[PDB]
Amino acid sequence: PPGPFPWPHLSFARLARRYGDVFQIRLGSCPVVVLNGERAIRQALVQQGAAFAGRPPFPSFQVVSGGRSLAFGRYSERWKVQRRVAHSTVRAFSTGQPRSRRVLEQHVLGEARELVRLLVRGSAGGAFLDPAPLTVVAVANVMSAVCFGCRYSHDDAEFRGLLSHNEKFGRTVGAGSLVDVLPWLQRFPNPVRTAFRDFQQLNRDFYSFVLDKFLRHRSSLRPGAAPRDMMDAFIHTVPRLDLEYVPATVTDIFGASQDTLSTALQWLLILFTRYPEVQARVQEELDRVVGRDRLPCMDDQPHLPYVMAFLYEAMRFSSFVPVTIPHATTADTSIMGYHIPKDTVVFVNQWSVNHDPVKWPNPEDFNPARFLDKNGFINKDLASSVMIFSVGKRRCIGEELSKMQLFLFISILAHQCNFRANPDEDSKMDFSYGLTIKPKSFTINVTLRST
Ligand code: HEM
Ligand SMILES: C[C@]12CC[C@@H]3c4ccc(O)cc4CC[C@H]3[C@@H]1CC[C@@H]2O
């Protein structure tokens, strides 16, 4: 592999155009490999998936979910069991339990209507507002209903703690990651360390919060009649797994859906405002198939080719998850002719797959018609090649869950309201990097619409 190069996610694409699809970088102490091409990634993660299905052993990882995290657990024989049930259980709720689709669809509807309420009221007359704090609230409330059944009221005190948990979490994860590349920072006092502690105590305070919900759920109506929410489904579905694994995976299912689905909606909104033509086409397609007397539902998703095309290309354009969770090699392997030793950290650049000019002819241009190939004038299945949920054995287990969720959100948001940009904000979607690519602070005006 090309020798370690010294110094965002765009920098990785700069070196791939010059030093090859695969190369090494020095991250302080640890050396790391980078995969940038769809060829180098599909090869490593799909073909040789079992070889790249590992995670680095980091300080940030273990405290999460009480050292039993699915997202940060090492590749092990018991981990494989943790995923199989985790993937199967979550798949059960999103699609397959006609009830869970309903129980989920009800929770998405409810919070989605609360969203247009607070969005319109906040834009009374000609007022503009920042939708970022509303998207995080809608995401946190919905996922609480999926994990714990109870969809709290926005003023509920316990719900205020969840919101307060996500904030500090996203604000201190940076320190938790700095220790992973600068482990000596813990050898003396400094602000990063003082923050790393706050991050580790957070995942303890929050795991106990979820462990409680588990106990109070377990010793409650146990005929097995129906899973109220994700918690029961995990209990019903239980090498051997310690019973403590059920709440450990739910702590990940919650923490995972937060920052991404929020950013997802933030992009879907700021895009409606910067491209009013496509917003119209989206708006036309809902009135034509669904009508004006009822709200959209999932059973219309097949009959809504453009709405999803807008979704799939919003994910491609933003690529708000530019780099996946760092992988580690399970054994020695070779990719593109290079030797790869074991226990080596390897990043996966999803941004390079979504902006490779050969694949996507005009990469930096927002055009949802890509996934609509007019010869059939129906949605084309190229979406599967959009890299945002990753690939292989560590791919997101909530892919088919967040697709329905987001589909129901923008379809309700666009079926009821008209999103206008702010004329003073200089257009030009400016990005805020780190975690996921959130669009830097913006404001929009949301008004109802008629037909
Ligand atoms: C827009 C929505 C989402 C995006 C873009 C997203 C993205 C990702 C990414 C980049 C990874 C790491 C893949 C890798 O390491 O190769 C991942 C893994 C994961 N996701 Fe998400 N995610 C989303 C929503 C969700 C949801 C809704 C859930 C749960 C219902 C979830 C749970 C997880 C878990 C548990 C993992 C770890 C899987 C593993 O390590 O084997 N995510 N996702
Ligand atoms: C790491 C990300 C933010 C933190 C998310 C998280 C946060 C906590 C957790 O226990 C699991 C996960 C898995 C999905 C993670 C996301 C995948 C991409 C995003 O950057």
> What HEC string does 46-60 produce?
HHCHHHCCECCCCHH
**Side-chain-facing half-sphere of 352: CA atoms under 13 Å:** 27
Closest to 434 (Cα-Cα) out of 263, 193, 233: 263
Query: How far is Cα 327 from Cα 343, in angstroms, rounded to an integer?
Result: 9
Nearest-angstrom CA–CA distance, 162 and 192: 23
CA angle (240, 244, 247) in 5-degree steps? 120
Residue 45 alpha carbon, nearest atom of ligand 1: 16
**Gap between the Cα atoms of 439 and 268, Å rounded:** 10
- Header resolution in angstroms: 3.1
Q: Which residues contact 228 (CB under 8 A, 6 or more apart)?
A: 103, 149
Burial of 429 per CB tally in 10 Å (0-12, 13-18, 19+)? middle
- C-alpha pair distances (Å), 343 with each of 40, 327, 392, 400: 18, 9, 18, 31
Paired strand residues for 362? none
Ligand 2 geometric centre to CA of 408 (Å): 22
Q: What are phi and psi of 357, to 5 degrees?
A: -55, -30
Instruction: Give the span between the Cα atoms of 275 and 190, in whole angstroms.
Output: 46
Domain map (residue ranges) of the chain: 1-451
Query: Dihedral through CA 321, CA 323, CA 325, CA 326, nearest 10?
Result: 180
Joined together, the tokens standing for residue 228 give 């109220």
Backbone angles phi, psi at 171, to 5 degrees: -85, -20
For the CA atoms of 225, 230, 233, 235, what is the dihedral angle to 10 degrees? -110
User: Residue 449: is it exposed, middle or buried by C-beta count within 10 angstroms (0-12/13-18/19+)?
Assistant: middle
Residues with CB under 6 A from ligand 2: 64-65, 69, 71, 252, 255-256, 259-260, 321, 325, 435-436
Q: Are 13 and 349 in contact (CB under 8 A)?
A: yes
With CA atoms as reference, report the closest residue to 439 among 314, 333, 292, 332.
314
Q: Which of 252, 323, 396, 438 to mutate to test the pocket of ligand 1 (most atoms within 8 A of CB)?
A: 396
Query: Do the bridges between strand 338-340 and strand 417-420 make them parallel or antiparallel, or are there none, so unpaired?
Result: unpaired
1-451: CATH architecture: Orthogonal Bundle (1.10)
Q: Which residues line ligand 1 (CB under 6 A)?
A: 70-71, 83, 90, 252-253, 256-257, 260-261, 264, 321, 324-325, 348, 388-390, 394-398, 401-402
Among 445, 438, 451, which Cα is nearest to 260's?
Answer: 438
Cβ–Cβ < 8 Å for 22, 335: yes
Q: Return left, alpha or beta for 149; rule: phi > 0 is left, psi -120 to 50 is alpha, else beta.
A: left
At what angle are helices 305-318 and 399-416 packed, to 10 degrees? Answer: 110
Amino acid at 132: A
